[PDB]
Every structure is written in C-alpha cells, then in structure tokens.
Amino acid sequence: ALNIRVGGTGMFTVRMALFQTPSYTQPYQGSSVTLSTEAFLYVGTMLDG
Amino acid sequence: PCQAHRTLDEYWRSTEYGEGYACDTDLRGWYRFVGQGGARMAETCVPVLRCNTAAPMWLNGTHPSSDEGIVSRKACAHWSGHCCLWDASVQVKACAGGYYVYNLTAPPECHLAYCTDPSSVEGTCEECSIDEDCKSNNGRWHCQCKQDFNITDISLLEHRLECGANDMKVSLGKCQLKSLGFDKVFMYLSDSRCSGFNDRDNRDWVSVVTPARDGPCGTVLTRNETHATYSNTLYLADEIIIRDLNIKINFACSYPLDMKVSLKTALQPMVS
Amino acid sequence: PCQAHRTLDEYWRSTEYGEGYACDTDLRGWYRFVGQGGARMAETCVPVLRCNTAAPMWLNGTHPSSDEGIVSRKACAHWSGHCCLWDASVQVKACAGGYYVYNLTAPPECHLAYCTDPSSVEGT
Ligand SMILES: *[C@@H]1O[C@H](CO)[C@@H](O[C@@H]2O[C@H](CO)[C@@H](O[C@@H]3O[C@H](CO)[C@@H](O)[C@H](O[C@H]4O[C@H](CO)[C@@H](O)[C@H](O)[C@@H]4O)[C@@H]3O)[C@H](O)[C@H]2NC(C)=O)[C@H](O)[C@H]1NC(C)=O
Ligand SMILES: *[C@@H]1O[C@H](CO)[C@@H](O[C@@H]2O[C@H](CO)[C@@H](O)[C@H](O)[C@H]2NC(C)=O)[C@H](O)[C@H]1NC(C)=O
Ligand SMILES: *[C@@H]1O[C@H](CO)[C@@H](O[C@@H]2O[C@H](CO)[C@@H](O)[C@H](O)[C@H]2NC(C)=O)[C@H](O)[C@H]1NC(C)=O
Ligand SMILES: *[C@@H]1O[C@H](CO)[C@@H](O)[C@H](O)[C@H]1NC(C)=O
Ligand SMILES: *[C@@H]1O[C@H](CO)[C@@H](O)[C@H](O)[C@H]1NC(C)=O
Known part of the structure; x- marks a missing residue:
C-alpha cells in the first residue's frame, strides 16, 4: 500500500447585516446610511461557514 | 486531398433506392x-439491382481509421449473383473530421456505380472534449487525449483540492488517470457510498466531494487550540477488487477560528 | 385584499418609540x-425622529369607513421640519371587522418608514 499525503486550507464565511429594524429581520442593501446620533443601530454578524 | 476535393449532394446513392440505369x-x-445518400461507401456487397444501377458496387475490406495516410483498396462489383465479379482501383484516405475522400475511377463498362450506406451519421466527434483528439480505430471515431499526457509513476498524480467552506472536494483530471492505467477508476472514501463522479470546468475531471463535517462520510475531525482539520482517506482502483498497487489518498484541509468582518455600507452621523 | 394580505406584528413601529433608521x-x-404598535397607522405627521425612523410617514386624511371600497391616499413624509415633504402612493381599503389593509409602496429614499398609532383597539 502506497500512501500519498496532501491537503488544503479553507476559509469560513462570516458577514454582517445592517438591520433596518430592531429584532434583526431585514438587512441593508445600500452603501451609505445617514442617521442622527440619537438613533439606535441594529446590527449583527452571521455565519455560513 | 482533404482540402482539394469535390462534393456530391445526391440522395440517390443510398443503398435503399429501388433501381436505375x-x-x-x-x-x-x-x-x-x-x-x-450517405457519407461512406458500402462495406458489404449489397444485393443486386440497387443504387440506381443494375450492378451496384462496394468496397471490400474496411474503412481506414484516423491517421493512416494513403490507403489502396480494390472496389468490387456485385452482379449475376456472384459478389465481387468486376474490380476497380480506389484510394481511400481519412481526414480531420467526420468525412472521407475517395479516388473514384470509372469502372470498365457501364451499369456499374457506387453506393452509400447510412454509415455512422449518428456517431459524432464533438462529444470528444477539446483536449481529446478526433482519433479513430477501424473506422470508429474515439477520443484519444493528448499523447503528451504520459505519467508513469503515481506520486506525480495531480490532485485538485479546494477546501470550500461547507465541504472539501478532491478533483482529478481524467486524462492523467487514463494515462496511469485505469480505464475506469473507483474513488472510495472511508465509506464506499461516497463514490466519485465526473465534472467538467476547464477539462475532464472526476472528483470526490466530502462534506466538511464530523462523521458524515466517516470524516474524522481533529481540532487543536489553533485550527480544525478534517482527515479522511480515499481509495483508487481500476476495478472493483484490488490485487496490487494500493492507492490511499489521505487529504486533510483545515479552517480557521479567529477571523474578521467589516461592514460594506458607509455610515454618517449628524448631531446638532 | 381583505383575505390576501401579510400580517405585521411590530411593537417598535409605534409613534412612542424613540428612533431608529x-x-x-x-x-x-x-x-x-x-x-x-397598533392596527391603524398614524393619521397625523408624527414629530420627526420616531417610529424607529429618522423620517417616519403618515397617511394624510382619514381612514375610510366601512363599505367604502378601494380608497386612494398619498402617504406624507414629515422630515426636516416640513411635514409631508416627500410623498408616496397608498391604497387603503376597509375590511370586515376592526382592521384595515394598505397598499404599502417603497419610499423613494431610505430612512422612511411607517408608524402605527394606538388607534381604536378600545373601540370594539
Ligand atoms: C494546530 O493544527 C493546525 C492545523 O493542522 C496547525 O497548523 C499547521 O502548522 C503546521 C506546522 O507549521 C503546518 O505544517 C506544514 O508542513 C509542511 C512542511 O513541513 C507544509 O505543508 C507547510 O508549509 C507550507 O506553508 C505554506 C502553505 O501553503 C506555503 O508557504 C508552502 O506550501 C509551505 O510548504 C507547513 O509547514 C501546517 O500547514 C499548518 N496547517 C495549516 C496551515 O492548515 C497548527 O500548527 C497546530 N497547532 C499546534 C499543534 O499547536
Ligand atoms: C487516386 O490516387 C492515385 C495514386 O495517388 C492517383 O494517380 C493514379 O496513380 C496510378 C499509380 O501511379 C496511375 O497508374 C494512375 O494513372 C493515376 N490515375 C490517374 C487518373 O491519373 C489517381 O489519380 C487518384 N484518383 C482520383 C480519381 O483522384
Ligand atoms: C395597491 O393597488 C394598486 C392598484 O391596484 C396595485 O397595482 C398598482 O397599480 C398601479 C396603477 O395601475 C400601477 O402603476 C402599479 O405598477 C401597480 N403595482 C404593481 C406592484 O403592480 C398595487 O400593486 C397595490 N400595492 C400594494 C403594495 O399592494
Ligand atoms: C476483397 O475482400 C474480401 C473480403 O475479405 C475478400 O474475400 C476478397 O478476396 C477481396 N478481394 C481480393 C481481390 O482479394
Ligand atoms: C395631505 O393631507 C393634509 C391634511 O389635510 C394636507 O395638508 C396635505 O396638503 C395633503 N397632501 C396633498 C398632496 O394633498
């Protein structure tokens, strides 16, 4: 029996979504978002790794 | 030869036509x-009174394969119930592609003409990939790959491993394996239910897809403080059984645990 | 219409909520x-920076009474101090019972979302 040893290196996929709303239902498709300091931000990081 | 010839778009030369003069x-x-009518001229002595002629003719022997050069055949003529009663000189030459060119001479007397069988119009060569030459053997076109693709040993075998996020897959260009001596391969994981399959992206490949999980195909996950590796074993053989030259591909690719994100949308504050 | 619609349950949509985007x-x-949040939406231009929105909207005019059919209204957008500075098109229709439906269309620009006043859950 002959044994060959090879391999690789892969990266998991992880993102963020700028959730327009609290409770994190809808992400953001834009590129420039303009708020006032008093407004809250609702974000997170998701994992399709 | 292949470039200096005339065509005959005639449907009456087929071996199905009733009778003629x-x-x-x-x-x-x-x-x-x-x-x-057909693309090749007859291989067996067709019964008398066909091909718009009282005494149809045929080519004895077989059509040459690809890459032979000039070939001489003696076209026979069937008449009076005796196949190959009159004889003529013909010169058959194959060509790059699915066609032939013939050195067509006049038979000794009238009432002699050539036929055309339906031949292998169904058989095509586009099914051969771009790296597969339009070769032929005994008049039947086959896909012989690059003769330059010639590897003797097995250590030099090409392994296309990309470690995708969801799963890892090991690909093998089937040209190198067919040059290695396996007309058909059998990629067996730790569980043989994980048999490989063919896929074409830039050339011919046969590949095994192993999910990047612990156990789904007997996959062994081994995670240390830094990374996490999936280690399994693949098995190759030209037939169902193995008697010599055991093949074991112990591939393992590892994913990271510390890793980063930044948002793709600019944000702008305004305050009084 | 009254049978073909999508339920929206959001407590943050109210005019009482602080602000969002x-x-x-x-x-x-x-x-x-x-x-x-409420079954009916805001009938007046709520003060700016509410309903989890920098610039929330409101339906100008009144909700249709029962047996009114398709009613076309234009949703106004209070922003920068000018109530109804931007406009949208809505189609509010009465429905059997204490609830309504709306034809909610996408705002021309972001930071524009709807509200719901407490309305008349008391009115039974
Ligand atoms: C925890 O486990 C992880 C994952 O298994 C491990 O990371 C590994 O570190 C070792 C030790 O350095 C690497 O070993 C490889 O060995 C050979 C040569 O000995 C080569 O394949 C590698 O060098 C290559 O590095 C680059 C890779 O493309 C290139 O510059 C070039 O190909 C080089 O030849 C390397 O030395 C092994 O690769 C990593 N695993 C990876 C990167 O996936 C880690 O060390 C472990 N931690 C412990 C045990 O504490
Ligand atoms: C087919 O090929 C032959 C040989 O290349 C061509 O020439 C004939 O050659 C033989 C042998 O030397 C001569 O005896 C004949 O006289 C040649 N034939 C002619 C017609 O000149 C031949 O011409 C080719 N036939 C056709 C029909 O193209
Ligand atoms: C609300 O009602 C309108 C009117 O039936 C729906 O259809 C729109 O009708 C106008 C006028 O003809 C068209 O210009 C629009 O393109 C139509 N919209 C669509 C999406 O086809 C409208 O769809 C309804 N809106 C909602 C949100 O339900
Ligand atoms: C033509 O080929 C046939 C088939 O093999 C053979 O019987 C015949 O003898 C051949 N003709 C000559 C003149 O040899
Ligand atoms: C919406 O209704 C309000 C309140 O009656 C009114 O001030 C405003 O002009 C209306 N908008 C349009 C576009 O007519």
Whole structure:
C-alpha cells in the first residue's frame, strides 16, 4: 500500500447585516446610511461557514 | 486531398433506392459524399439491382481509421449473383473530421456505380472534449487525449483540492488517470457510498466531494487550540477488487477560528 | 385584499418609540397591522425622529369607513421640519371587522418608514 499525503486550507464565511429594524429581520442593501446620533443601530454578524 | 476535393449532394446513392440505369464514368478526382445518400461507401456487397444501377458496387475490406495516410483498396462489383465479379482501383484516405475522400475511377463498362450506406451519421466527434483528439480505430471515431499526457509513476498524480467552506472536494483530471492505467477508476472514501463522479470546468475531471463535517462520510475531525482539520482517506482502483498497487489518498484541509468582518455600507452621523 | 394580505406584528413601529433608521423598501403588498404598535397607522405627521425612523410617514386624511371600497391616499413624509415633504402612493381599503389593509409602496429614499398609532383597539 502506497500512501500519498496532501491537503488544503479553507476559509469560513462570516458577514454582517445592517438591520433596518430592531429584532434583526431585514438587512441593508445600500452603501451609505445617514442617521442622527440619537438613533439606535441594529446590527449583527452571521455565519455560513 | 482533404482540402482539394469535390462534393456530391445526391440522395440517390443510398443503398435503399429501388433501381436505375445511371452509370459512373465521368467521375474523376477526390470526392466527399454528403447528403441523405450517405457519407461512406458500402462495406458489404449489397444485393443486386440497387443504387440506381443494375450492378451496384462496394468496397471490400474496411474503412481506414484516423491517421493512416494513403490507403489502396480494390472496389468490387456485385452482379449475376456472384459478389465481387468486376474490380476497380480506389484510394481511400481519412481526414480531420467526420468525412472521407475517395479516388473514384470509372469502372470498365457501364451499369456499374457506387453506393452509400447510412454509415455512422449518428456517431459524432464533438462529444470528444477539446483536449481529446478526433482519433479513430477501424473506422470508429474515439477520443484519444493528448499523447503528451504520459505519467508513469503515481506520486506525480495531480490532485485538485479546494477546501470550500461547507465541504472539501478532491478533483482529478481524467486524462492523467487514463494515462496511469485505469480505464475506469473507483474513488472510495472511508465509506464506499461516497463514490466519485465526473465534472467538467476547464477539462475532464472526476472528483470526490466530502462534506466538511464530523462523521458524515466517516470524516474524522481533529481540532487543536489553533485550527480544525478534517482527515479522511480515499481509495483508487481500476476495478472493483484490488490485487496490487494500493492507492490511499489521505487529504486533510483545515479552517480557521479567529477571523474578521467589516461592514460594506458607509455610515454618517449628524448631531446638532 | 381583505383575505390576501401579510400580517405585521411590530411593537417598535409605534409613534412612542424613540428612533431608529428603518426604511421599508421591500414591503410588497397588502398588510394588516397588529400588535401593541397598533392596527391603524398614524393619521397625523408624527414629530420627526420616531417610529424607529429618522423620517417616519403618515397617511394624510382619514381612514375610510366601512363599505367604502378601494380608497386612494398619498402617504406624507414629515422630515426636516416640513411635514409631508416627500410623498408616496397608498391604497387603503376597509375590511370586515376592526382592521384595515394598505397598499404599502417603497419610499423613494431610505430612512422612511411607517408608524402605527394606538388607534381604536378600545373601540370594539
Ligand atoms: C494546530 O493544527 C493546525 C492545523 O493542522 C496547525 O497548523 C499547521 O502548522 C503546521 C506546522 O507549521 C503546518 O505544517 C506544514 O508542513 C509542511 C512542511 O513541513 C507544509 O505543508 C507547510 O508549509 C507550507 O506553508 C505554506 C502553505 O501553503 C506555503 O508557504 C508552502 O506550501 C509551505 O510548504 C507547513 O509547514 C501546517 O500547514 C499548518 N496547517 C495549516 C496551515 O492548515 C497548527 O500548527 C497546530 N497547532 C499546534 C499543534 O499547536
Ligand atoms: C487516386 O490516387 C492515385 C495514386 O495517388 C492517383 O494517380 C493514379 O496513380 C496510378 C499509380 O501511379 C496511375 O497508374 C494512375 O494513372 C493515376 N490515375 C490517374 C487518373 O491519373 C489517381 O489519380 C487518384 N484518383 C482520383 C480519381 O483522384
Ligand atoms: C395597491 O393597488 C394598486 C392598484 O391596484 C396595485 O397595482 C398598482 O397599480 C398601479 C396603477 O395601475 C400601477 O402603476 C402599479 O405598477 C401597480 N403595482 C404593481 C406592484 O403592480 C398595487 O400593486 C397595490 N400595492 C400594494 C403594495 O399592494
Ligand atoms: C476483397 O475482400 C474480401 C473480403 O475479405 C475478400 O474475400 C476478397 O478476396 C477481396 N478481394 C481480393 C481481390 O482479394
Ligand atoms: C395631505 O393631507 C393634509 C391634511 O389635510 C394636507 O395638508 C396635505 O396638503 C395633503 N397632501 C396633498 C398632496 O394633498
């Protein structure tokens, strides 16, 4: 029996979504978002790794 | 030869036509049979009274394969119930692609003409990939790959491993394996239910897809403080059984645990 | 319409909520507002920076009474101090019972979302 040893290196996929709303239902498709300091931000990081 | 010839778009030369009188003595040069009559001229002595002629003719022997050069055949003529009663000189030459060119001469007397069988119009060569030459063997076109693809040992075998996020897959260009001596391969994981399959992206490949999980195909996950590796074993053989030259591909690719994100949308504050 | 609509249960949509940045650029179709936020939406231009939105909207005019059919209204957008500075098109229709439906269309620009006043959950 002959044994060959090879391999690789892969990266998991992880993102963020700028959730327009609290409770994190809808992400953001834009590129420039303009708020006032008093407004809250609702974000997170998701994992399709 | 292959570039200097005349065509004959005639549907009446087929071996299905009822009967006729026309005889060929004005046929002079190299010809490319094209149309519903046929692309190749007959291989067996067709029964008498066919091909729009009382005494149809045929080529004895077989059509040459690809890459042979000039070949000489003696076309026979069937008449009076005795196959190959009259004889003529013909010169058959294959060509790059699915056609032939013939040195068509005048038979000794009238009432002699050539036929065309349906031949292998169904058989095509586009099914051969771009790296597969349009070769032929005994008149049947096959896909012989690059002769340059010649590797003797097995250590030099090419392994296309990309470690995708969801799963890892090991690919093998089937040209190198067919040059290695396996007309058909059998990629067996730790569980043989994980048999490989063919796929084409830039050339011919056969590949095994192993999910990047612990156990789904007997996959062994081994995670240390830094990374996490999936280690399994693959098995190759040209047949169902193995008697010598055991093949074991112990591939393992590892994913990270510390890793980063930044948002793709600019944000702008405004305050009084 | 009254049978073909999508339920919306959001407690943050109320005019009472502090502020956010929602813009309903994807809300397609007819919607039935439910929850503590309210079943009917805001009838007046709520003061700016509310309803989890920098610039929330309001339906100008009144809700249609029962047996009114398809009613076309234009949703006004209070922003920068000018109530109804931007406009949208809505189609509010009465429904059997104490609830309504709306034809909510995407705002021309983001930071534009709807509200729901407490309305008349008391009115039974
Ligand atoms: C925890 O486990 C992880 C994952 O298994 C491990 O990371 C590994 O570190 C070792 C030790 O350095 C690497 O070993 C490889 O060995 C050979 C040569 O000995 C080569 O394949 C590698 O060098 C290559 O590095 C680059 C890779 O493209 C290139 O510059 C070039 O190909 C080089 O030849 C390397 O030395 C092994 O690769 C990593 N695993 C990876 C990167 O996936 C880690 O060390 C472990 N931690 C412990 C045990 O504490
Ligand atoms: C087919 O090929 C032959 C040989 O290349 C061509 O020439 C004939 O060659 C033989 C042998 O030397 C001569 O005896 C004949 O006289 C040649 N034939 C002619 C017609 O000149 C031949 O011409 C080719 N036939 C056709 C029909 O193209
Ligand atoms: C609300 O009602 C309108 C009117 O039936 C729906 O259809 C729109 O009608 C106008 C006028 O013809 C068209 O210009 C629009 O393109 C139509 N919209 C669509 C999406 O086809 C409208 O769809 C309804 N809106 C909602 C949100 O339910
Ligand atoms: C033509 O080929 C056939 C088939 O093999 C053979 O019987 C015949 O003898 C051949 N003709 C000559 C003149 O040899
Ligand atoms: C919406 O209604 C309000 C209140 O009656 C009114 O001030 C405003 O002009 C209306 N908008 C349009 C576009 O007519």
